[PDB]
Amino acid sequence: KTMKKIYVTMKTLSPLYTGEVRREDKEAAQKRVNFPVRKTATNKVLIPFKGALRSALEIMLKAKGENVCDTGESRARPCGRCVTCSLFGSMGRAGRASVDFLISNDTKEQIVRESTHLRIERQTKSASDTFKGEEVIEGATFTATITISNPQEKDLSLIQSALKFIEENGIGGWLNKGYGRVSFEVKSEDVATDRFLK
Amino acid sequence: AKTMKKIYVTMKTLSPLYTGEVRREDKEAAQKRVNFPVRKTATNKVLIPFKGALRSALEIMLKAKGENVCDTGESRARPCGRCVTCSLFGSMGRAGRASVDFLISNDTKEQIVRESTHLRIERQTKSASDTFKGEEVIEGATFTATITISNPQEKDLSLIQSALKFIEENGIGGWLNKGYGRVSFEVKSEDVATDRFLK
Amino acid sequence: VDFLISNDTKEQIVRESTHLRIERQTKSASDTFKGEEVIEGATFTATITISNPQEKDLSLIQSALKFIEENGIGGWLNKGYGRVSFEVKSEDVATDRFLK
Amino acid sequence: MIKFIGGASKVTGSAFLLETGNAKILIDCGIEQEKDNNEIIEKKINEIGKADICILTHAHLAASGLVPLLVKKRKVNKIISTPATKELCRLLFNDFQRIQEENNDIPLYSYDDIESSFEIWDEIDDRNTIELFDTKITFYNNSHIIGSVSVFIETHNGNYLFSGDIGSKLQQLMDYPPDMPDGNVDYLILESTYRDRLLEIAKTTCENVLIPSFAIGRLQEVLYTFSNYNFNFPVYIDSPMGSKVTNLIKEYNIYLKKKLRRDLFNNKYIAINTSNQSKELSNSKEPAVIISASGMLEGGRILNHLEQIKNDENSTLIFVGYQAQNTRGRKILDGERIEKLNSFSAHADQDELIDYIERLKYTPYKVFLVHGEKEQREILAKRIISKKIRVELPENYEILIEKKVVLNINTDNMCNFASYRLMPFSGFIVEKDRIEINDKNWFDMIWALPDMSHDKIIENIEYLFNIKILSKNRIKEFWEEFCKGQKAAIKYITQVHRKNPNTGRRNWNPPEGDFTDNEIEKLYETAYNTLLSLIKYDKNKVYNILINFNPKL
Amino acid sequence: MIKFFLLETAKILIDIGKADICILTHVNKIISTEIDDRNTIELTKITFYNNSSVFIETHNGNYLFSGDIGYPPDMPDGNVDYLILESTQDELIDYIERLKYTPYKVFLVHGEKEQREILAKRIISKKIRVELPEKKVVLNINTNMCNFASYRLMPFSGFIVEKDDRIEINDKNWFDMIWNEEYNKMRSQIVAEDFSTDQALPDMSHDKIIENIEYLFNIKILSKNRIKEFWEEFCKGQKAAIKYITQVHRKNPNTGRRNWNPPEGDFTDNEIEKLYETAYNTLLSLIKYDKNKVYNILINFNPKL
Amino acid sequence: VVLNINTDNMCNFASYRLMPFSGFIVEKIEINDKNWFDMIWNEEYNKMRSQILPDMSHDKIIENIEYLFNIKILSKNRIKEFWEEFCKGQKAAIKYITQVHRKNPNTGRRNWNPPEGDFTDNEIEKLYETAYNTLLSLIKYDKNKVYNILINFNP
RNA sequence: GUUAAAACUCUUCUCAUGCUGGAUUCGAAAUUAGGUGCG
RNA sequence: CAGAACACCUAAUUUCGAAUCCAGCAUGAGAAGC
Ligand SMILES: [Zn+2]
Ligand SMILES: [Zn+2]
Ligand SMILES: [Zn+2]
* Nearest-angstrom CA–CA distance, D255 and E165: 47
Which of D91, D458, D35, D481 is CA-nearest to residue D248? D91
Q: How far is E186 from chain C (nearest CA, A)?
A: 19
Please tell me which residue lies nearest to nucleotide G31, judged from CA to C1'.
Answer: A119
Which of E66, E61, E12 is CA-nearest to residue E41? E12
The Cβ of residue E22 has, within 10 Å, a number of other Cβ atoms equal to 23
* Nearest-angstrom CA–CA distance, D310 and D282: 12
Interface check B22 vs C, CB under 8 A: yes
Quick one: three-class SS letters along B63-119?
A: HHHCCCCCCCCCCCCCCCCCCHHHHHCECCCCECCEECCCCEECCCHHHHEEEEEEE
* Nearest-angstrom CA–CA distance, E269 and D417: 51
* Nearest-angstrom CA–CA distance, F114 and F118: 11
Gap from C67 CA to G9 C1', in Å?
35
Distance C28 CA to ligand 1 centre (A): 16
Gap from F78 CA to H25 C1', in Å?
28
Residues forming a β-bridge with E22: E14
H or E stretch covering E131: strand E129-131
DSSP-derived secondary structure letter, A177: T
Gap from A137 CA to G31 C1', in Å?
21
Residue pair B175/B35 in contact by the 8 Å Cβ criterion: no
Strand G proximal residues, A:50-89, Cβ < 7 Å: 50-52, 54-55, 71-72, 77-78, 88-89
Gap from E33 CA to H15 C1', in Å?
86
3-state secondary structure of D494: helix
The Cβ of residue E254 has, within 10 Å, a number of other Cβ atoms equal to 9
H or E stretch covering D41: helix D38-48
Determine, for residues C28 and A149 on separate chains, whether the beta-carbon distance falls below 8 Å: no
* Nearest-angstrom CA–CA distance, A88 and B178: 9
H or E stretch covering A2: strand A2-12
CA dist D96 → D33, D85, D92, D114, F53 (Å): 11, 15, 6, 11, 66
Strand order in the sheet with F24-26: F2-3, F30-32, F24-26
Gap from D509 CA to H13 C1', in Å?
6
3-state secondary structure of D426: strand
* Nearest-angstrom CA–CA distance, D426 and D442: 12
Please tell me which residue lies nearest to nucleotide G36, judged from CA to C1'.
Answer: A126
Overall size of chain E counted in residues: 305
* Nearest-angstrom CA–CA distance, A34 and A25: 12
* Nearest-angstrom CA–CA distance, E257 and E273: 10
3-state secondary structure of D381: helix
Determine, for residues D363 and E102 on separate chains, whether the beta-carbon distance falls below 8 Å: yes
Burial D420-438 (b: 16+ CB within 10 A, else e): bbbbbbbbbbbbeeebbbb
3-state secondary structure of E5: coil
Residues forming a β-bridge with D406: D436
* Interface contacts (B, C; CB < 8 Å): 90
Residue pair D384/D360 in contact by the 8 Å Cβ criterion: no
* Nearest-angstrom CA–CA distance, F48 and F30: 25
- The residue of chain D with its CA nearest to that of F46 is D426
DSSP-derived secondary structure letter, D471: -
Cβ contacts (< 8 Å) between F44 and chain D: which residues? 426
Which of B110, C30, A147, A134 is CA-nearest to residue D54? B110
Q: Residue type at A102? A: L
3-state secondary structure of D517: helix
Cβ contacts (< 8 Å) between D399 and chain E: which residues? 60-61, 81-82, 104
* Nearest-angstrom CA–CA distance, D151 and D161: 6
Residue pair D353/D168 in contact by the 8 Å Cβ criterion: no
* Nearest-angstrom CA–CA distance, B14 and D28: 35
Q: How far is B164 from chain D (nearest CA, A)?
A: 27
The Cβ of residue F65 has, within 10 Å, a number of other Cβ atoms equal to 21
Residue pair E22/E46 in contact by the 8 Å Cβ criterion: yes
CA angle D338, D344, D347 (to 5 degrees): 130
The Cβ of residue B77 has, within 10 Å, a number of other Cβ atoms equal to 16
Supply the Cα-derived Rg of chain A in whole angstroms. Answer: 19
Strand order in the sheet with E6-7: E2-3, E6-7, E12-13
Torsion of CA D452, D454, D458, D460, to 10 degrees: -10
Ramachandran category for residue B61: left, alpha or beta (phi over 0 → left; psi -120 to 50 → alpha)? alpha
H or E stretch covering C68: helix C57-71
CA dist D549 → B149, D472, D546 (Å): 59, 7, 6
Crossing angle for the helix pair F121-140 and F90-101, to the nearest 10 degrees: 180
* Nearest-angstrom CA–CA distance, B164 and D46: 32
CA angle E131, E135, E136 (to 5 degrees): 115
Residue pair B60/C24 in contact by the 8 Å Cβ criterion: yes
Residues forming a β-bridge with B145: B9
- D317-319 vs D130-132, strand pairing mode: unpaired
Interface check A192 vs B, CB under 8 A: yes
HSE toward the beta carbon, residue D325, CA cutoff 13 A:
3
- D338-340 vs D317-319, strand pairing mode: parallel
Residues forming a β-bridge with E182: none
Residue pair D10/D62 in contact by the 8 Å Cβ criterion: yes
Residue pair C46/C5 in contact by the 8 Å Cβ criterion: yes
Residue pair D353/D193 in contact by the 8 Å Cβ criterion: yes
User: In a 10 Å sphere around its CB, with 0-12 CB exposed, 13-18 middle and 19+ buried, how is residue E121 labelled?
Assistant: exposed
* Nearest-angstrom CA–CA distance, A123 and D62: 54
Determine, for residues F44 and D447 on separate chains, whether the beta-carbon distance falls below 8 Å: no
Distance B148 CA to ligand 2 centre (A): 20
Compare CB distances from E186 to F13, F22, F49 and report the shortest one's residue. F22
- The residue of chain E with its CA nearest to that of D400 is E60
CA dist D126 → D80, D161, D256 (Å): 12, 14, 12
Compare CB distances from A25 to D119, D121, D505 and report the shortest one's residue. D119
Determine, for residues A75 and F114 on separate chains, whether the beta-carbon distance falls below 8 Å: yes
Instruction: Say what the resolution is, in angstroms.
Output: 3.1
* Nearest-angstrom CA–CA distance, D88 and D331: 29
* Nearest-angstrom CA–CA distance, E85 and E107: 6
Q: Residue type at E38? A: R
Determine, for residues E165 and C9 on separate chains, whether the beta-carbon distance falls below 8 Å: no
- D187-190 vs D158-164, strand pairing mode: parallel
Residue pair D336/D330 in contact by the 8 Å Cβ criterion: no
Residues 6+ apart with CB under 8 A from F60: F134
3-state secondary structure of D187: strand
CA dist D155 → B103, D130, D158, E136, E264 (Å): 34, 12, 5, 20, 63
Crossing angle for the helix pair E224-235 and E291-298, to the nearest 10 degrees: 170
The Cβ of residue D473 has, within 10 Å, a number of other Cβ atoms equal to 10
Which of C8, A30, D2, C46 is CA-nearest to residue E139? C8
What is the torsional sign of CA F68, F69, F72, F77? positive
- E166-170 vs E137-140, strand pairing mode: parallel
Cβ contacts (< 8 Å) between B101 and chain C: which residues? 80, 83
3-state secondary structure of F135: helix
Q: Residue type at E93? A: I
Strand G proximal residues, B:71-110, Cβ < 7 Å: 72-73, 76, 78-79, 89-96
HSE toward the beta carbon, residue D334, CA cutoff 13 A:
10
Question: From the CB coordinates, do chains F and C have 3 or more pairs under 8 Å?
Answer: no
* Nearest-angstrom CA–CA distance, D470 and D3: 49
Determine, for residues A74 and F109 on separate chains, whether the beta-carbon distance falls below 8 Å: yes
- B98-99 vs B142-149, strand pairing mode: antiparallel
3-state secondary structure of E26: coil
Residues 6+ apart with CB under 8 A from A153: none
* Nearest-angstrom CA–CA distance, D547 and D99: 47
Cβ contacts (< 8 Å) between C25 and chain A: which residues? 149-150
Residues 6+ apart with CB under 8 A from E163: C9, D421, E136
Nucleotide nearest residue A72, measured CA to C1': G25
* Nearest-angstrom CA–CA distance, A94 and D308: 76
CA dist D502 → A132, D322, D505 (Å): 20, 40, 9
Q: Give pairs for E297-302: CB < 8 Å, separation 24+.
A: E297/E206, E297/E209, E297/E210, E297/E213, E298/E213, E298/E227, E298/E230, E298/E231, E301/E213, E301/E214, E301/E217, E301/E222, E301/E224, E301/E227, E302/E224, E302/E227, E302/E228, E302/E231
Interface check B182 vs C, CB under 8 A: no
The Cβ of residue C6 has, within 10 Å, a number of other Cβ atoms equal to 15
Cβ contacts (< 8 Å) between D502 and chain A: which residues? none
Gap from A1 CA to G8 C1', in Å?
69
* Nearest-angstrom CA–CA distance, D238 and D230: 20
Residues 6+ apart with CB under 8 A from E180: F84, F87
Residues forming a β-bridge with A37: A19
Crossing angle for the helix pair E238-248 and E269-286, to the nearest 10 degrees: 170
* Nearest-angstrom CA–CA distance, A83 and D529: 59
Strand G proximal residues, B:19-48, Cβ < 7 Å: 19-22, 27, 35-36, 39
**How many angstroms separate the first and last alpha carbons of chain C?**
26
Strand G nucleotides within a 7 Å radius of protein CB atoms = 14-35
Distance A71 CA to ligand 1 centre (A): 8
Residue pair E20/E28 in contact by the 8 Å Cβ criterion: yes
3-state secondary structure of A190: strand
* Interface contacts (C, E; CB < 8 Å): 3
Question: From the CB coordinates, do chains D and A have 3 or more pairs under 8 Å?
Answer: yes
Residue pair E22/E13 in contact by the 8 Å Cβ criterion: yes
Residue pair D145/D81 in contact by the 8 Å Cβ criterion: no
User: In a 10 Å sphere around its CB, with 0-12 CB exposed, 13-18 middle and 19+ buried, how is residue E104 labelled?
Assistant: buried
Residue pair C81/C75 in contact by the 8 Å Cβ criterion: yes
- C14-22 vs D51-55, strand pairing mode: unpaired
Cβ contacts (< 8 Å) between C34 and chain B: which residues? 24
CA dist D15 → B102, D3, D28, D454, E53 (Å): 35, 8, 5, 47, 42
Mutate to test the interface with F, among A69, A75, A91 (most CBs of F within 10 A): A75
Which of A137, A191, A144 is CA-nearest to residue A163? A144
* Nearest-angstrom CA–CA distance, F155 and F153: 6
3-state secondary structure of D191: coil
CA angle D289, D295, D297 (to 5 degrees): 75
Cβ contacts (< 8 Å) between C10 and chain E: which residues? none
- The residue of chain C with its CA nearest to that of A95 is C26
User: In a 10 Å sphere around its CB, with 0-12 CB exposed, 13-18 middle and 19+ buried, how is residue A175 labelled?
Assistant: middle
DSSP structure string for A124-168: T-SEEEEEEEEEEPTT-EEEEEEEESS--SSHHHHHHHHHHHHHH
Cβ contacts (< 8 Å) between D417 and chain E: which residues? 178, 182
Which of D93, D59, D69 is CA-nearest to residue D164? D59
Determine, for residues F11 and E189 on separate chains, whether the beta-carbon distance falls below 8 Å: no
Overall size of chain D counted in residues: 553
- C14-22 vs D210-213, strand pairing mode: unpaired
Torsion of CA B92, B95, B97, B102, to 10 degrees: 100
CA dist B188 → A130, B5, B172 (Å): 54, 11, 19
Residue pair D45/D70 in contact by the 8 Å Cβ criterion: yes
H or E stretch covering F24: strand F24-26
CA dist D23 → D77, D120, D155, D333, E19 (Å): 11, 17, 10, 47, 39
Which of C24, E262, D332, F20 is CA-nearest to residue F7? F20
CA angle D236, D237, D240 (to 5 degrees): 150
Which of B68, D132, D405 is CA-nearest to residue E169? D405
DSSP-derived secondary structure letter, A89: B
Q: How far is C28 from chain A (nearest CA, A)?
A: 6
CA dist E165 → D179, D403, D422 (Å): 41, 18, 15
Gap from B102 CA to H23 C1', in Å?
22
Gap from E40 CA to H25 C1', in Å?
77
Find the ligand nearest to A85 CA: 1
DSSP structure string for E232-283: HHHHT-HHHHHHHHHHHSPPPTTT---SSPPPSS---HHHHHHHHHHHHHHH
* Nearest-angstrom CA–CA distance, E120 and C58: 55
